[PDB]
Design an enzyme around this catalytic site. Structure first.
Site, mmCIF file in Angstrom:
data_model
loop_
_atom_site.group_PDB
_atom_site.id
_atom_site.type_symbol
_atom_site.label_atom_id
_atom_site.label_comp_id
_atom_site.label_asym_id
_atom_site.label_seq_id
_atom_site.Cartn_x
_atom_site.Cartn_y
_atom_site.Cartn_z
ATOM 1 N N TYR B 54 -67.460 40.082 93.881
ATOM 2 C CA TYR B 54 -66.950 38.784 93.479
ATOM 3 C C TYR B 54 -67.839 37.722 94.126
ATOM 4 O O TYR B 54 -67.913 37.664 95.332
ATOM 5 C CB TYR B 54 -65.474 38.580 93.933
ATOM 6 C CG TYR B 54 -64.541 38.400 92.765
ATOM 7 C CD1 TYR B 54 -64.589 37.220 92.001
ATOM 8 C CD2 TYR B 54 -63.658 39.419 92.377
ATOM 9 C CE1 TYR B 54 -63.792 37.048 90.909
ATOM 10 C CE2 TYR B 54 -62.843 39.265 91.256
ATOM 11 C CZ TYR B 54 -62.918 38.088 90.516
ATOM 12 O OH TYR B 54 -62.136 37.913 89.397
ATOM 13 N N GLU B 56 -68.043 34.020 92.919
ATOM 14 C CA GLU B 56 -67.814 32.718 92.280
ATOM 15 C C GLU B 56 -68.661 31.603 92.864
ATOM 16 O O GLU B 56 -68.885 31.556 94.053
ATOM 17 C CB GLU B 56 -66.344 32.334 92.390
ATOM 18 C CG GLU B 56 -65.484 32.938 91.293
ATOM 19 C CD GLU B 56 -64.022 33.032 91.643
ATOM 20 O OE1 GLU B 56 -63.699 33.865 92.484
ATOM 21 O OE2 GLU B 56 -63.195 32.287 91.105
ATOM 22 N N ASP B 208 -79.830 26.424 69.468
ATOM 23 C CA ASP B 208 -79.340 27.798 69.726
ATOM 24 C C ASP B 208 -80.339 28.722 69.110
ATOM 25 O O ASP B 208 -80.348 28.870 67.897
ATOM 26 C CB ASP B 208 -77.966 28.019 69.087
ATOM 27 C CG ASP B 208 -77.369 29.405 69.377
ATOM 28 O OD1 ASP B 208 -78.084 30.350 69.797
ATOM 29 O OD2 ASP B 208 -76.139 29.508 69.171
ATOM 30 N N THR B 234 -78.553 34.124 73.570
ATOM 31 C CA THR B 234 -78.025 35.411 73.981
ATOM 32 C C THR B 234 -79.192 36.239 74.448
ATOM 33 O O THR B 234 -80.326 35.903 74.133
ATOM 34 C CB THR B 234 -77.308 36.128 72.810
ATOM 35 O OG1 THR B 234 -78.208 36.316 71.708
ATOM 36 C CG2 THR B 234 -76.089 35.334 72.379
ATOM 37 N N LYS B 237 -80.148 40.508 71.613
ATOM 38 C CA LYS B 237 -80.713 40.648 70.284
ATOM 39 C C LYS B 237 -82.218 40.890 70.387
ATOM 40 O O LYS B 237 -82.651 41.860 71.058
ATOM 41 C CB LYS B 237 -80.392 39.419 69.459
ATOM 42 C CG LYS B 237 -78.928 39.081 69.360
ATOM 43 C CD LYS B 237 -78.762 37.866 68.463
ATOM 44 C CE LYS B 237 -77.311 37.514 68.309
ATOM 45 N NZ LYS B 237 -76.677 36.923 69.517
HETATM 46 C C1 LIG Z 1 -60.001 24.345 95.425
HETATM 47 C C2 LIG Z 1 -61.121 24.759 94.517
HETATM 48 C C3 LIG Z 1 -61.633 23.853 93.585
HETATM 49 C C4 LIG Z 1 -62.668 24.217 92.736
HETATM 50 C C5 LIG Z 1 -63.194 25.497 92.832
HETATM 51 C C6 LIG Z 1 -62.692 26.405 93.767
HETATM 52 C C7 LIG Z 1 -61.652 26.050 94.603
HETATM 53 C C8 LIG Z 1 -61.150 27.050 95.589
HETATM 54 C C9 LIG Z 1 -61.283 26.755 96.939
HETATM 55 C C10 LIG Z 1 -60.829 27.629 97.904
HETATM 56 C C11 LIG Z 1 -61.003 27.282 99.397
HETATM 57 F F1 LIG Z 1 -60.373 28.093 100.242
HETATM 58 F F2 LIG Z 1 -60.544 26.063 99.616
HETATM 59 F F3 LIG Z 1 -62.289 27.246 99.708
HETATM 60 C C12 LIG Z 1 -60.239 28.848 97.524
HETATM 61 C C13 LIG Z 1 -60.088 29.178 96.139
HETATM 62 C C14 LIG Z 1 -59.415 30.481 95.693
HETATM 63 C C15 LIG Z 1 -59.639 31.660 96.658
HETATM 64 C C16 LIG Z 1 -59.067 33.000 96.163
HETATM 65 C C17 LIG Z 1 -61.108 31.853 97.097
HETATM 66 C C18 LIG Z 1 -57.914 30.198 95.729
HETATM 67 C C19 LIG Z 1 -57.393 29.731 96.792
HETATM 68 N N1 LIG Z 1 -56.916 29.299 97.774
HETATM 69 C C20 LIG Z 1 -57.108 30.494 94.625
HETATM 70 N N2 LIG Z 1 -55.802 30.264 94.675
HETATM 71 O O1 LIG Z 1 -57.693 31.055 93.422
HETATM 72 C C21 LIG Z 1 -59.030 31.170 93.234
HETATM 73 N N3 LIG Z 1 -59.641 31.505 92.098
HETATM 74 N N4 LIG Z 1 -60.997 31.486 92.455
HETATM 75 C C22 LIG Z 1 -61.244 31.144 93.730
HETATM 76 C C23 LIG Z 1 -62.624 31.027 94.313
HETATM 77 C C24 LIG Z 1 -59.909 30.894 94.346
HETATM 78 C C25 LIG Z 1 -60.544 28.239 95.187
HETATM 79 C C1 LIG Z 2 -76.828 31.615 66.728
HETATM 80 C C2 LIG Z 2 -75.815 32.441 67.463
HETATM 81 N N1 LIG Z 2 -75.208 31.932 68.545
HETATM 82 C C3 LIG Z 2 -74.296 32.578 69.278
HETATM 83 C C4 LIG Z 2 -73.886 33.882 68.994
HETATM 84 C C5 LIG Z 2 -72.809 34.493 69.875
HETATM 85 O O1 LIG Z 2 -73.131 35.724 70.477
HETATM 86 P P1 LIG Z 2 -71.983 36.626 71.119
HETATM 87 O O2 LIG Z 2 -71.693 37.631 70.007
HETATM 88 O O3 LIG Z 2 -72.723 37.263 72.273
HETATM 89 O O4 LIG Z 2 -70.762 35.793 71.388
HETATM 90 C C6 LIG Z 2 -74.475 34.575 67.823
HETATM 91 C C7 LIG Z 2 -74.052 35.982 67.449
HETATM 92 N N2 LIG Z 2 -74.656 36.469 66.221
HETATM 93 C C8 LIG Z 2 -73.919 37.280 65.254
HETATM 94 C C9 LIG Z 2 -74.911 38.138 64.470
HETATM 95 O O5 LIG Z 2 -76.034 37.668 64.235
HETATM 96 O O6 LIG Z 2 -74.630 39.289 64.111
HETATM 97 C C10 LIG Z 2 -75.471 33.816 67.031
HETATM 98 O O7 LIG Z 2 -76.071 34.341 65.952
HETATM 99 C C1 LIG Z 3 -54.387 35.683 88.951
HETATM 100 C C2 LIG Z 3 -55.815 35.686 88.472
HETATM 101 N N1 LIG Z 3 -56.074 35.486 87.177
HETATM 102 C C3 LIG Z 3 -57.304 35.462 86.655
HETATM 103 C C4 LIG Z 3 -58.466 35.652 87.407
HETATM 104 C C5 LIG Z 3 -59.801 35.569 86.699
HETATM 105 O O1 LIG Z 3 -60.615 36.721 86.831
HETATM 106 P P1 LIG Z 3 -62.152 36.631 86.384
HETATM 107 O O2 LIG Z 3 -62.871 36.344 87.705
HETATM 108 O O3 LIG Z 3 -62.380 38.017 85.862
HETATM 109 O O4 LIG Z 3 -62.301 35.482 85.437
HETATM 110 C C6 LIG Z 3 -58.326 35.884 88.864
HETATM 111 C C7 LIG Z 3 -59.529 36.119 89.745
HETATM 112 N N2 LIG Z 3 -59.206 36.170 91.161
HETATM 113 C C8 LIG Z 3 -60.196 35.810 92.147
HETATM 114 C C9 LIG Z 3 -59.804 36.464 93.449
HETATM 115 O O5 LIG Z 3 -58.605 36.695 93.635
HETATM 116 O O6 LIG Z 3 -60.652 36.783 94.286
HETATM 117 C C10 LIG Z 3 -56.944 35.898 89.395
HETATM 118 O O7 LIG Z 3 -56.694 36.119 90.682
#
Ligand SMILES: Cc1ccccc1-c1cc(C(F)(F)F)cc([C@@]2(C(C)C)C(C#N)=C(N)Oc3n[nH]c(C)c32)c1
Ligand SMILES: Cc1ncc(COP(=O)(O)O)c(CNCC(=O)O)c1O
Ligand SMILES: Cc1ncc(COP(=O)(O)O)c(CNCC(=O)O)c1O
Ligand SMILES: Cc1ccccc1-c1cc(C(F)(F)F)cc([C@@]2(C(C)C)C(C#N)=C(N)Oc3n[nH]c(C)c32)c1
Ligand SMILES: [Cl-]
Lengths: 442, 442
Positions: B54, B56, B208, B234, B237
């Protein structure tokens, strides 16, 4: 007309870093609550040539033919998902196309409410996800707060969801969706209670169980399926799958949702599914259903309890003073050291955890805690007895952090200068490395 | 506490289908314009344990630590992207976190114009993508039509972009962004003429280039970087990478766009990046830069030229009467058959192509053509001489499709019944399979 030289030969530059990454994973005590380690079988899928195929649409309604074997793989995954979460395929539908959790939540929310639509979720500070409507005074941080109108509900000063505030908010706000299930919340959820508040306003119930998915599937924790219209979950965390997401929809409670959700995923938001993900997910979903995996999930909560107990025994404060799941949040105000300081110190000793907000932090500017979880270490074979050592390494890291803040001052720039060359850190790292390097590693 | 048993042993059911999938890819004449075959080195990355992490945020500004090796991989990819597309890292920036093409486009558009923002793109019917604003009378099919206000421009009755119509639209509509670069457009783009229209209305220029990426990189076609504020592509392709997308932004033309694009990808839309994708992309981007890949890209255009010429020699009509790139669109109005009919026939003979609209088609209900492209077959080792045979197979399939329509009638259900058991198809298939199975297969 291609280069089939192995990765080592083709790209020695990249191959070296990956061997390095592998070693750092091998020698880290990984406490990231959202991380896990995939087996070779799940990684054979991710590297499979099935990712070559463009197969926009759904099975049997595919845009292109020659999707015979992709259709079987996509349907086998949907089947295993429904089985694993103990849902009847007559009553529940599943979409397996979302590329990741945030994508799945945005897609599922749009399906229900559309643009300008009204949603309620937990504040990011209080444990909710970014995709649960999070914004700030300065900016609408998530698309979920911008393409939707969102309101955010806090947990009380003890760190528990305050249902009274949710209802107080729900009646004045009148949303079409209320989101529950969280990113950093150490207690179980009262979905039943949530289901009652949504009926009171006629809102949809949305349960995001990504952090607690294995518990829900193995029935260790409350079942949101009994009350929720939608259940979203990622596949890469406690579930131990690849990076992907699942959207579950209850047909019986809401006929016509299946198309609404399926069209949201494609063609409203995504293009071609990623087929290697789908195969990989199916491979993990077989593993989830076995009684062996329940043994593993049981072990995660056992370790998490022992870890929590062991941290309290060393006089460290925990949000809600304990946990019902895989994760804990440590309240560090006692020691007057910030979460980011402890994250830096922990990385120096190869301890992966993350900084985390706590109820007292009105503002996100300084997180007053850190969050830890047991799924990754449980995966590496660590038992209850092993948790005292982890608690001990964490206690030593907090102390060292206090020493370095005293010596170099509170500013984070100043603090960081202290970290390199510290004898105790190097001694702690060595200790971490020796123990981590020894453990089973998929 | 995990299962390390190989995929075959652990999940024999899945391993069978993937083994079948591998065999179908191996024995198929793949004419899908968007498909390609990745090498073993790209697939090793996709299967790498780097996807466990992870991370982010962006490099040197991660939310979590222990991203040292991840930061090197993420920076190695961005560098190589800028290198591969011949852009100076001072003038151009790139974001490598978008999970796929459709996610990248939505994200970039949001960054530029926000919710309710105004965009223009080519109609889906004429060659435009779904993420270029596509909607219908009955429904806003794409989020790009719903979360944005979009206007759609058509190509003329000869199948060429009509720039007068673009300007006629742009002055009345007054969009903030104008998209060019298309999904099924067989000719090159006058990006310069787009800039002229964009400057007139103070709108951004979005190119694009996903279908034509390799051409742009290897300087065989018009370079949109000279005129565009944003370039999206992308990687799966013609570029031959994994399934991912890249977003390019021009810092000099628009300072502070970097933060806007980067914040859009995270935390506005996505969460954790998929590091195996980025690793995989880094691996392909090295190959993109070699002169051996230019050789391959050149070969794709040679095969495409030869294919268009061999099809005209068999009295088959092509939209725009030819191609400047990798793709051809066949106008089947001559034979009173539909593209959907021809797609079934071709899948019956292991020829992968897709149905495609043409300018005369008012509606996408009955697309009157098919689209083909040479990148996959070029990858497998096919040369100019090999094209006459593929053009021979396509003519034979068109002929058979006319016969089956004669025998069973124009209704699609009725037509499909004719397909199984046909001696000529079984004969044509074996011919296809014998030839396809022989070729180099990464
Ligand atoms: C406040 C903010 C604004 C914009 C982008 C990211 C954040 C942020 C900041 C923190 C901090 F601890 F302050 F640094 C933590 C997080 C957490 C944790 C798990 C690291 C968080 C929390 N507390 C929750 N609930 O959910 C998340 N989803 N993704 C991330 C990365 C987070 C997010
Ligand atoms: C111009 C263009 N932009 C964006 C995308 C989106 O790609 P994802 O499938 O990865 O979301 C495609 C997909 N092209 C469909 C095809 O030519 O078969 C595309 O042709
Ligand atoms: C409740 C919840 N929902 C959705 C997501 C989104 O997952 P993607 O990163 O696959 O977009 C997270 C990620 N959680 C970050 C963490 O707990 O470390 C989550 O904790
Ligand atoms: C009309 C419609 C509405 C909703 C969802 C998909 C489509 C659609 C239909 C067709 C068909 F008419 F059947 F040939 C084709 C396509 C194409 C091709 C490349 C298959 C298409 C085209 N013509 C363009 N330009 O772009 C795409 N992006 N994705 C897809 C799948 C497509 C899309
Ligand atoms: Cl992937």
């Amino acid at each position: 007309m291609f280069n089939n030289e192995p990765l080592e030969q083709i790209d020695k530059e990249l191959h070296d870093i990956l061997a390095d990454e592998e070693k750092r994973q091998r020698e880290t005590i990984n406490l990231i609550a959202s991380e896990n380690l995939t087996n070779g079988a799940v990684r054979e899928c991710l590297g499979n040539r099935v990712s070559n195929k463009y197969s926009e649409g759904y099975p049997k309604k595919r845009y292109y033919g020659g999707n015979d074997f992709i259709d079987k793989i996509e349907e086998l995954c949907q089947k295993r998902a429904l089985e694993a979460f103990n849902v009847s395929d007559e009553e529940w539908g599943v979409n397996v196309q979302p590329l990741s959790g945030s994508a799945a939540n945005v897609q599922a929310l749009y399906a229900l409410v559309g643009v300008k639509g009204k949603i309620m979720g937990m504040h990011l500070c209080s444990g909710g996800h970014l995709t649960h409507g999070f914004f700030d005074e300065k900016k609408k941080v998530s698309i979920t707060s911008d393409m939707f109108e969102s309101k955010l509900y806090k947990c009380n000063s003890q760190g528990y969801v305050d249902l009274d505030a949710v209802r107080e908010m729900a009646l004045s706000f009148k949303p079409k969706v209320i989101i529950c299930g969280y990113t950093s919340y150490p207690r179980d959820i009262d979905y039943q209670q949530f289901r009652q508040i949504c009926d009171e306003v006629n809102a949809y119930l949305f349960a995001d169980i990504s952090h607690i998915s294995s518990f829900v599937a193995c029935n260790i924790l409350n079942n949101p399926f009994l009350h929720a219209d939608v259940v979203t979950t990622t596949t890469h965390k406690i579930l131990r799958g690849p990076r992907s997401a699942l959207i579950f929809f209850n047909k019986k409670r809401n006929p016509g949702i299946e198309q609404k959700i399926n069209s949201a995923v494609f063609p409203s938001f995504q293009g071609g599914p990623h087929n290697n993900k789908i195969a990989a997910v199916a491979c993990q979903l077989k593993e989830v259903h076995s009684p062996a995996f329940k043994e593993y999930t049981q072990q995660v909560l056992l370790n998490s309890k022992a870890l929590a107990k062991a941290l309290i025994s060393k006089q460290i404060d925990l949000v809600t003073n304990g946990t019902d799941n895989h994760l804990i949040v440590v309240d560090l105000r006692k020691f007057s050291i910030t979460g980011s300081k402890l994250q830096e110190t922990c990385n120096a000793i190869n301890v992966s955890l993350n900084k985390n907000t706590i109820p007292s932090d009105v503002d996100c500017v300084s997180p007053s805690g850190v969050r830890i979880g047991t799924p990754a270490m449980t995966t590496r074979g660590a038992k209850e007895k092993d948790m005292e050592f982890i608690a001990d390494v964490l206690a030593r890291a907090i102390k060292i952090t206090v020493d370095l803040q005293e010596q170099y001052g509170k500013k984070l720039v100043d603090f960081k200068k202290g970290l390199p060359g510290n004898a105790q850190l190097q001694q702690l790292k060595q200790e971490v490395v020796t123990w981590a390097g020894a453990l089973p590693f998929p």
